[PDB]
Structure 1
Amino acid sequence: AVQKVVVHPLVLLSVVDHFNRIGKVGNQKRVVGVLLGSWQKKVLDVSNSFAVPFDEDDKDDSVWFLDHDYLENMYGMFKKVNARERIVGWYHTGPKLHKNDIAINELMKRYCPNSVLVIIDVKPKDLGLPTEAYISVEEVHDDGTPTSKTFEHVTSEIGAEEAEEVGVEHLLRDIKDTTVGTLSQRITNQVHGLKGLNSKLLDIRSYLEKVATGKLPINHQIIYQLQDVFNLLPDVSLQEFVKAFYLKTNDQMVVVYLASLIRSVVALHNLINNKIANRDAEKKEG
């Protein structure tokens, strides 16, 4: 395999309304329903999906039920009314996974050989995009365990469609179009500096988890390696960027030229009609 996904918010509301279907009744654990999908390339798409009744008792996390007859009858309806659509996986509303999810996944990989799950949150405040993709494949193990069948975080994104926001941006009414030039950059400053480096501080919290704990899979495979991709910049004290300040002066050069010349011409913009219309409105007032 999967490149990434294309997921419209329509199917997310198709999770939300069934969360309304279960929020009125006894919610045991969470929602598990079908994720239909439009798989064409190694990229993915989802235009629609549906749900299915489900309970689970947490004693061996193996007593859990869908209705495959209901799944294939309503899938026969939706396949009948739309030949484009097919199943691509499932979803769950509780944002943390558990051990049964490989039995859900591998139990429904019999219909199509991939069955991607979707993490969402019905009350999201801290995540970025809600949508999430795994794939249940193996890297065996370095020790080669008996089939360490593993979910893999395939990258994920919100999909888009022409004329799908006809509802949406009319509904929300709150959008300030083109806040370039005012405070959007510092919204992204607070949220990327703070909300980026706090994630860095939870990764260094996981480093302390390797200090006092974390011997499970101490993970000396990807961590220092892509952290050496990070360590393309060893930015230690004395800072060692003598070969970057004439670079910085080259970067500052043209832009401060544009501010000098161009903003002098911005003065040349305001002054003419400001004076002429000024004294028109001044000495032509009486």
Structure 2
Amino acid sequence: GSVSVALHPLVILNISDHWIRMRSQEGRPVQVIGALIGKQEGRNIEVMNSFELLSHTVEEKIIIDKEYYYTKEEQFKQVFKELEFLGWYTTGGPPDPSDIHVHKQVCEIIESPLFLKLNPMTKHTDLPVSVFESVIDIINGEATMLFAELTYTLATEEAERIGVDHVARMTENSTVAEHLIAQHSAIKMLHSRVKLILEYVKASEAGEVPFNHEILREAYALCHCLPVLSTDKFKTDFYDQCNDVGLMAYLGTITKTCNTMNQFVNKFNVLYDRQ
């Protein structure tokens, strides 16, 4: 990593739920302020579970209601032993002078604060890019610090992965379609990656891009690895699995047929033989 920022998917869901709850409560969308915590290892961010930090949003000014955050500090310290304050989050578009003022207020508490600006009104494919944090630029006279965007990573643990998969579309639209849409999306993105690699190879062949001797070697290795497990033992195991699933389907088509036959005889016994 070049900037060592690692966001967790739980934070995004936390911010989304906060924003949706406030929007429903107050009728219209409203800007929210939060507090990202995590683990710092010198040059690592590793954001994790975030809490409310309501503070104030009065008129056009944000007041310092950080005493509530101070009370929340010892509260969250009881359930998160190895977690410390790292930054704060917001909901909106580009950074604003109000964001600068709130960041100046936050730097009073911590020396290295972040600034997440999850945008919920976005209508473009790639995800809103998390945090625009800065090293604070200083010039003669007024500080007039800005934000220098640096990249983020979506490192996630196994429990988070399972939870995210469960929330995502997985098992009116039938279960076959829901199961197949996930595979369709995964194959679609894999196909896009492979197609762009092929486009780069074609561009290098024609001469649009300079010839990099290592990218094409890696591409040749990738092409050579393409026939994955083509052994006779793999085929035997695959056919064994297919036969097992076929038997498991037969046992259950039989069950459905038995159920329908039972319904048929139940309806037949009350129509012809009235006893």
TM-score range, shorter chain: 0.5 to 0.7
1:85 aligns with 2:73: no
Residue of structure 2 in register with 1:164 after alignment: 160
> What 5-or-longer segments of structure 1 have no aligned partner?
194-234, 264-268, 270-286
Counterpart of 1:18 in structure 2: which amino acid? Answer: H
1:149 and 1:187 mapped to 2: Cα distance? Answer: 40
* Residues 129-156 of structure 1 deviation map (CA, whole Å, 9 limit, x = unaligned): 3343333434445xx5642312111221
Of 167, 184, 188 in structure 1, the residue corresponding to residue 189 of structure 2 is 184
Residue 55 of structure 1 is matched in structure 2 by 57
Q: Is the 8 A contact 2:9 2:160 kept in 1?
A: no
Partner of residue 21, structure 2: 21
Q: Secondary structure at the match of 2:116?
A: coil
Structure 1 residues 57 and 170: alpha-carbon distance in aligned structure 2, compared to 1, 3 A threshold: same
For 2:104, give the aligned amino acid.
Answer: E
Structure 2 CA distance for aligned equivalents of residues 254 and 163 of structure 1: 31
Q: Is the 8 A contact 1:4 1:154 kept in 2?
A: no
2:126 counterpart residue number: 128
The verdict on how the C-alpha distance between 1:178 and 1:108 changes in structure 2, with shifts beyond 3 A counting, is same
Q: Secondary structure at the match of 2:86?
A: strand
CA distance in 2, matches of 1:253, 1:157: 27
Structure with more of its chain in helix, by fraction: 2
Structure 2 unaligned blocks of 5 or more: 171-177, 198-202, 236-275
Deviation at 1:3, TM superposition (A): 2.3
TM-score, normalising length: structure 2: 0.60
**Distance in 1 (alpha carbons) for counterparts of 2:122 and 2:152:** 17
Task: Provide closer, same or farther for how the CA distance between residues 175 and 55 of structure 1 changes in structure 2, counting only shifts above 3 A.
Answer: farther
Amino acid at match of 1:161: E
| Matches of 2:88 and 2:122, distance apart in 1 | 19
TM-score (norm. length: structure 1)? 0.58
Pick closer, same or farther for the CA change 1:178–1:64 going to 2, 3 Å.
same
What letter corresponds to residue 80 of structure 2 in structure 1? N
Q: Percent of aligned pairs with the same residue?
A: 22
The within-5 A match list for 1:173-252 is 173=170, 174=178, 183-188=188-193
Q: Distance in 2 between matches of 1:181 and 1:11?
A: 24
Say if 2:22 and 2:30, in contact at 8 Å, map to a contact too: no
Instruction: Describe the shift of the 1:155–1:21 C-alpha distance in structure 2 as closer, same or farther (beyond 3 A).
Output: same
Deviation at 1:121, TM superposition (A): 2.3
Deviation per residue, 1:176-216 (Å, 9 max, x gap)? 677799543444589x79xxxxxxxxxxxxxxxxxxxxxxx
1:68 offset after TM fit, Å?
Answer: 1.2
User: 1:50 Cα shift?
Assistant: 0.8
Could you tell me whether the CA contact under 8 Å between 2:129 and 2:152 is conserved in 1?
Answer: yes
**2:222, 2:14 → 1: CA distance?**
51
- Equivalent residue number for residue 216 of structure 1: none
In structure 2, distance between residues paired with 1:253 and 1:7? 33
Whole-angstrom distance in 2 between the partners of 1:243 and 1:68: 56
Matches within 5 A, 1:74-113: 74-113=72-111
The separation in 1 between residues aligned to 2:132 and 2:13, in whole angstroms, is: 21
- Please name the residue that 2:263 is paired with: none
**What secondary structure does 2:38 align onto?**
strand
Q: For the Cα contact (< 8 Å) 1:28–1:56, is it kept in 2?
A: no
CA distances 1:233-275 after superposition (whole Å, capped 9, x unpaired):
xx9xx95889789x989x779969x99xxx9xxxxx9xxxxxx
Counterpart CA distance in 1 for 2:221 and 2:111 is 56
Q: Is the 8 A contact 2:131 2:152 kept in 1?
A: yes
- Distance change in 2, residues 1:27/1:105 (3 Å): farther
What letter matches 1:165 in structure 2?
Answer: R
Instruction: Tell me by how many angstroms 1:157 deviates.
Output: 1.9
Note if contact 2:88-2:113 (Cα within 8 Å) is conserved in structure 1: yes
Does structure 2 conserve the Cα–Cα contact (< 8 Å) formed by 1:36 and 1:48? yes
Question: Is the alpha carbon distance of 1:71 and 1:186 closer, same or farther for their aligned partners in structure 2, counting shifts above 3 Å?
Answer: same
Does the 8 Å CA contact 2:38/2:47 hold for their aligned counterparts?
Answer: yes
2:69 maps to 1:71 = yes
> Using the alignment, how far apart are the partners of 1:181 and 1:49 within structure 2?
30
Contact in 1 for aligned 2:8/2:155 (Cα 8 Å) = yes
Aligned to 2:35: 34
Cα deviations by residue, 1:205-232 (Å, 9 ceiling, x for unpaired) = xxxxxxxxxxxxxxxxxxxxxxxxxxxx
User: What residue identity is the alignment partner of 1:41?
Assistant: G
Query: Which amino acid is 1:22 matched to?
Result: M
